[PDB]
Amino acid sequence: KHSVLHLVPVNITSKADSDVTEVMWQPVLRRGRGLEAQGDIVRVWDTGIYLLYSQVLFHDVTFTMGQVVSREGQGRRETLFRCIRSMPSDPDRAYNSCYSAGVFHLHQGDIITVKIPRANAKLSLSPHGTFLGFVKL
Amino acid sequence: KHSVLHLVPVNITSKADSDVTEVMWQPVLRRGRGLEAQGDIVRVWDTGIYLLYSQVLFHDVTFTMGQVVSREGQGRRETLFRCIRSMPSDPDRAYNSCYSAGVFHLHQGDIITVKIPRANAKLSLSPHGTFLGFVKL
Amino acid sequence: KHSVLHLVPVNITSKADSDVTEVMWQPVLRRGRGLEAQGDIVRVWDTGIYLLYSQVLFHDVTFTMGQVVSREGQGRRETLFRCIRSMPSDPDRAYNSCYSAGVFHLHQGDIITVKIPRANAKLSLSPHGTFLGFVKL
Amino acid sequence: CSQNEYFDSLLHACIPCQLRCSSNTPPLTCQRYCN
Amino acid sequence: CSQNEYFDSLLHACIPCQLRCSSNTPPLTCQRYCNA
Amino acid sequence: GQCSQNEYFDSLLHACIPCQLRCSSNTPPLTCQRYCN
Ligand code: NI
């Protein structure tokens, strides 16, 4: 029985100056104990190797959209993976989901971030369109 | 060892008055039981938490294409995840694979469906373009 | 206790009159044995069932881009999966990542290849843009 | 939905019938309009 | 990056500002260029 | 791997595709090189 966490949106956040949009996460599935969503980040409590996966559903004409998944810890930021998607320029046609995943060594005390590097990104709060998850391997 | 199922298409079917296309599945990899393909749906025999992944390869000019993966059981429907891809409008150019995945609690008796919510959708039968899989975690 | 291997690019290669581009891989996460990167392929030593995932990031106007992941062994190539993305024709806008994954029975002596079927393909060497991994299940 | 729009079950939202007049098979509420 | 470009943190590249002008909220560097 | 004249078999799409679609690309397929030129 592997530890898992599957997270869906409660809300969006984007501050004025930043050129960044993030998602506030809430669990719909968990087993085992090594992880905890706190607002728009996930805290890592147990060191180990984890499968991390991220999907965001966009409805946004910005020529490219996507997300950047990182871990911060011990005074050091590292990008784990990015998903990038070209978008149609017509608002009514501009839908795309962006899915990426990988397996990474996360350490106790790390913070995982999921950032859309545009301000006020138009993205779905649907639990089946946008989500974020972990499996401890 | 972990129980698994990897499925590929045998053919596609689209009902008349519905705006849906489904796939009939064949198993190419099986370890253990707990899951069983029955034509267009997958039956869950063993309750558990599963990694579920789904790819469909489209050759279709419809402005968006994609797939909806759902669970039906105990008198209820629930979408697990959606994949969405905008398509080019020129038929010679309009190719996109759409991949998504997540971890879900599946219960004995459940029926897993993969539905493309357009009629007579043009999707590949190739086992390496379109597929469906499960790993009990 | 699962064997894992996460790999990132060092460089690309493309033989003159072939219409294929490959990636020379370097391991950045490794646990257990059974898998060995060497150059643009991965050798399988321990027979078993593996999660295989692959992402490539493209900056290319070629009408479609993507990758074909295969195994070779006992004089027999088998395509495992492929990822396909339509690209914008405007070079300023032409960015897309292509992610796919599946679970497969890999045999001792197999060679795993990741091929982009265009010559001189413009793909990122960024470790969080283009990557390849394995988890023995 | 409004007139000359359909509920798209993929996108979970109302969409104009113009966007489905290229499709091999447009939805049924859309078919009279795409003439 | 050079004049009338921004460093796009998603693409890790320098991109012309005009790509972001007629689209929601452009990056802060670009905002002056996108008006006048 | 065999198509009508002025097409190539695309190993990514596993389909016959007009050579015309690859003339904007940097390095066309070997068999298309004569058509694009
Ligand atoms: Ni295990």
| CA neighbor of C85 nearest in space, from C77, C94, C76, C72 | C94
Phi, psi of B129 (to 5 degrees): -100, -40
Against chain C, the chains showing at least 3 CB pairs within 8 Å are: A, B, E, F
Method: X-ray
For residue C136, give the chain B residue with the closest CA: B2
With b meaning 16 or more CB within 10 Å and e meaning fewer, what string describes B56-78? bbbbbbbbbbbbbbbbebeeeee
Against chain A, the chains showing at least 3 CB pairs within 8 Å are: B, C, D, E
Tokens representing residue C57 in the block: 């990031």
- Cβ within 8 Å, pair C89-F29: no
Under 8 Å between Cβ of C95 and C121: no
| CATH code at B1-137 | 2.60.120.40
Question: How close is the nearest chain A Cα to the Cα of E27, in Å?
Answer: 6
Under 8 Å between Cβ of C28 and C102: no
The DSSP symbol for F8 reads E
Phi, psi of E33 (to 5 degrees): -55, -35
Distance CA A98, CA A132 (A): 12
Q: How far is CA C38 from the centre of its chain?
A: 13
- The contacts of residue C55 (CB under 8 Å, 6+ apart) are A81, A100, A102, C83, C97, C98, C99, C129, C130, C131, C132
Sign of CA pseudo-dihedral B39, A53, C46, C68: positive
Chains C and F touch (3+ CB pairs under 8 A): yes
Place of tokens 């998603």: E10
Under 8 Å between Cβ of B112 and B39: no
Closest CB from D8, D22, D28 relative to B89: D22
Under 8 Å between Cβ of D21 and D15: no
How many whole angstroms from F25 Cα to the centroid of ligand 1? Answer: 45
- Cβ within 8 Å, pair B64-A93: yes
Closest CB from B51, B100, B105 relative to A55: B100
Chain B touched by F13 (CB under 8 Å): yes
- The contacts of residue F2 (CB under 8 Å, 6+ apart) are F9
B40 φψ region: left (φ > 0), alpha (ψ -120 to 50), beta (else): alpha
Under 8 Å between Cβ of C130 and C12: no
Closest CB from E10, E19, E24 relative to A117: E10
Under 8 Å between Cβ of C69 and C106: no
Under 8 Å between Cβ of E6 and E30: yes
| CA neighbor of C117 nearest in space, from C53, C64, C81, C77 | C64
Residue C27, number of CB atoms within 10 A of its CB: 16
- D-interface mutation test, from A58, A90, A92, A123, most D Cβ less than 10 A away: A92
Under 8 Å between Cβ of C66 and C114: no
Q: Domain ranges in chain C?
A: 1-137
Neighbouring C-alpha atoms within 13 Å toward the C-beta of C23: 32
Q: How far is CA D24 from the centre of its chain?
A: 12
Chain B touched by C67 (CB under 8 Å): no
Q: Where are the beta strands (DSSP E) in chain E?
A: 5-8, 13-16
Distance CA C127, CA A22 (A): 23
- Cβ within 8 Å, pair F12-C61: no
Q: How far is CA B135 from the centre of its chain?
A: 14
Residues recorded for chain B: 137
Distance CA C59, CA F29 (A): 18
The C-alpha R_g of chain A, in whole angstroms, comes to 15
How many whole angstroms from A33 Cα to the centroid of ligand 1? Answer: 16
Sorted by where each starts, the structural domains of chain D and their CATH numbers stand as 1-35 (4.10.1290.10)
| CA neighbor of C34 nearest in space, from C20, C21, C49, C19 | C49
* Secondary structure of A35-92 in HEC code, one letter for each residue: EEEECCEEEECCCEEEEEEEEEEEECCCCEEEEEEEEECCCCEEEEEEEEEECCCCHH
Question: How close is the nearest chain A Cα to the Cα of B27, in Å?
Answer: 24
- The contacts of residue D3 (CB under 8 Å, 6+ apart) are none
C-alpha distances in angstroms, C15 versus A14, B77, C41, C113, D15? 46, 52, 15, 15, 47
